[PDB]
Amino acid sequence: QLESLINKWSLELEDQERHFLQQATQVNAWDRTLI
Amino acid sequence: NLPPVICQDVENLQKFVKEQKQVQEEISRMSSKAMLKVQEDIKALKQLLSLAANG
Amino acid sequence: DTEGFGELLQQAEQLAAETEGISELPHVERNLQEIQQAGERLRSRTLT
Amino acid sequence: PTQSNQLINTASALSAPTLLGDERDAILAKWNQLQAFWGTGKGYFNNNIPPVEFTQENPFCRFKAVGYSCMPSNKDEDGLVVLVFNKKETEIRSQQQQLVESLHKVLGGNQTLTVNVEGTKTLPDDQTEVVIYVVERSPNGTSRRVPATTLYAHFEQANIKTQLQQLGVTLSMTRTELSPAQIKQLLQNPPAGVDPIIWEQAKVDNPDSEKLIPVPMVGFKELLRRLKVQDQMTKQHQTRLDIISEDISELQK
Amino acid sequence: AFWGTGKGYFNNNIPPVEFTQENPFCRFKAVGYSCMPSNKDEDGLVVLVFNKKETEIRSQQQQLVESLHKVLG
């Protein structure tokens, strides 16, 4: 039971971790462009 | 067979993963073209100022 | 890109109009074979 | 001893919990690891010790980056104190004389003091940034500005801060210039939960070291906070280009 | 006043003008550059100048640390 939510929230972390880094690089670019 | 508090923190994490994903979706609906159009305008208004200055 | 010659022409008209010791009369927009001749009719004075 | 015992409890919760006394503590290690990576929840690891409370400032929280920010370029003698209000700029501008009267009363109503608003600027989610300075007039007839640090050190007094909050103020700061001591002190330690390698690298990746400082980005809720300020700054760049277009339209005419 | 010393006697009912080297008319004046300090307040650096030789200060250095600690209560 719990481990079938863990191994799911590993894959849903390993999803969001990439979206966060790609959105962070996009934010740093648009901060440089607005300066 | 777990402590009831760990069952509550499994529900707290199921809420938090949805809160982060809703914000990751809210970010994934922004568009740079309002800021790109500021660079479109800065080129055009520099050119129109030079025509005015030279004239 | 699409940022053509008119931007550079706008600076070309400036370099001429900030060397004009303003006449009583305007200047002539020479055609391309008068431009070739105006070049060589001038080089033939520099190279003396 | 506090920080060291917190580190020992965090390590114990992430590698070797002893809560259940069988194979289920290895699944509890994975549960404590997952919560630490998400930056939320509780590392349960013994029956005699409080659990490790995981926040987004915990080192193992993965939703972290660094991103630049402009330092302020106004001097302490410029007196510039910022008040952010839970109000729209059209309300602030239409109340502006009543706001000046109210800030003057929060400065004790003193007849040597004048409150001035230098500017107002709309912010996200129905708020306004308001830039103010105070002028003191001396008993000989001269006037001076009141320094920004001095004016802020009046506003942060709990009996004054409570009255600013009753005018609708959400945040108070200076926009003061930072000295080489201050910049070289702020950079000297990684912020809470940033990795040291990422914090030293983000001093090299900083493209203008006189105007810009490295600032952490922690969770999507900070990325969205920047993007809402980028949206609002884009509109303020546009509102300035509109005016530059009207100026050039009169120049050519 | 030019030498930056002595006393300007000028009336029988008023004290004389006492001339120092700080008086405006003192001629022995120039300006010369000095380095400003480049350590922080948080660097904690306080200077104490002693009427002692550095060989005495270094040979007494632990007794000096004990004495400064007692002066800090």
Curated annotation (Swiss-Prot), chain A:
Localization: Nucleus, Nuclear pore complex; Cytoplasm, Cytoskeleton, Spindle pole; Nucleus envelope; Cytoplasm, Cytoskeleton, Microtubule organizing center, Centrosome
Post-translational modification: O-glycosylated. Contains about 10 N-acetylglucosamine side chain sites predicted for the entire protein, among which only one in the C-terminal. The inner channel of the NPC has a different redox environment from the cytoplasm and allows the formation of interchain disulfide bonds between some nucleoporins, the significant increase of these linkages upon oxidative stress reduces the permeability of the NPC.
Domain of life the protein comes from: Eukaryota
Quaternary structure and interacting proteins, as annotated: Component of the p62 complex, a complex at least composed of NUP62, NUP54, and NUP58. Interacts with NUP88. Interacts with NUTF2. Interacts with HIKESHI. Interacts with OSBPL8. Interacts with CAPG. Interacts with SAS6 and TUBG1 at the centrosome. Interacts with MCM3AP isoform GANP.
Domains (record comment): Contains FG repeats.
Similarity annotation: Belongs to the nucleoporin NSP1/NUP62 family.
Protein name, UniProt field: Nuclear pore glycoprotein p62
Organism encoding this protein: Homo sapiens
Residues of the full protein shown: 332 to 366 of 522
Swiss-Prot record, chain B:
Coiled coil residues, start to end: 11-31
Localization per Swiss-Prot or TrEMBL: Nucleus, Nuclear pore complex; Nucleus membrane
Domain of life: Eukaryota
Description of post-translational modifications: O-glycosylated.
Swiss-Prot/TrEMBL domain comment: Contains FG repeats. FG repeats are interaction sites for karyopherins (importins, exportins) and form probably an affinity gradient, guiding the transport proteins unidirectionally with their cargo through the NPC. FG repeat regions are highly flexible and lack ordered secondary structure. The overall conservation of FG repeats regarding exact sequence, spacing, and repeat unit length is limited.
Assembly, per entry: Component of the p62 complex, a complex at least composed of NUP62, NUP54, and NUP58. Interacts with NUTF2. Interacts with SRP1-alpha and Importin p97 proteins when they are together, but not with SRP1-alpha protein alone.
Family named by the database record: Belongs to the NUP58 family.
Purpose: Component of the nuclear pore complex, a complex required for the trafficking across the nuclear membrane.
Other comment: In rat, the p62 complex contains two different isoforms of NUP58. Isoform p45 has however not been isolated in human so far.
Name this protein carries in UniProt: Nucleoporin p58/p45
Annotated source species: Homo sapiens (Human)
Span covered, complete protein: 246 to 300 of 599
Swiss-Prot record, chain C:
Segments passing through the bilayer: none
Location in the cell: Nucleus membrane; Nucleus, Nuclear pore complex; Nucleus envelope
Phosphothreonine PTM positions: T48
Subunit and interaction comment: Part of the nuclear pore complex (NPC). Component of the p62 complex, a complex composed of NUP62 and NUP54. Forms a complex with NUP35, NUP155, NUP205 and lamin B; the interaction with NUP35 is direct. Does not interact with TPR. Interacts with SMAD4 and IPO7; translocates SMAD4 to the nucleus through the NPC upon BMP7 stimulation resulting in activation of SMAD4 signaling. (Microbial infection) Interacts with SARS-CoV translation inhibitor nsp1; this interaction may disrupt nuclear pore function.
Family: Belongs to the nucleoporin interacting component (NIC) family.
Function: Plays a role in the nuclear pore complex (NPC) assembly and/or maintenance. May anchor nucleoporins, but not NUP153 and TPR, to the NPC. During renal development, regulates podocyte migration and proliferation through SMAD4 signaling.
Protein's name in the database: Nuclear pore complex protein Nup93
Gene name tied to this protein: NUP93
Shown chain mapped onto the complete sequence: 2 to 49 of 819
UniProtKB/Swiss-Prot annotation, chain D:
Compartments reported by the entry: Nucleus, Nuclear pore complex; Nucleus membrane
Post-translational modification: O-glycosylated.
Similarity section: Belongs to the NUP54 family.
Domain notes: Contains FG repeats.
Oligomer status and interactors: Component of the p62 complex, a complex composed of NUP62, NUP54, and the isoform p58 and isoform p45 of NUP58. Interacts with NUTF2.
Known role: Component of the nuclear pore complex, a complex required for the trafficking across the nuclear membrane.
Disease listed for this protein: Dystonia 37, early-onset, with striatal lesions: A form of dystonia, a disorder defined by the presence of sustained involuntary muscle contraction, often leading to abnormal postures. DYT37 is an autosomal recessive form characterized by the onset of progressive dystonia, dysphagia, and choreoathetosis in the first months or years of life. Affected individuals show delayed motor development and may have impaired intellectual development.
Protein name as annotated: Nucleoporin p54
Gene: NUP54
Residue span relative to the full protein: 111 to 363 of 507
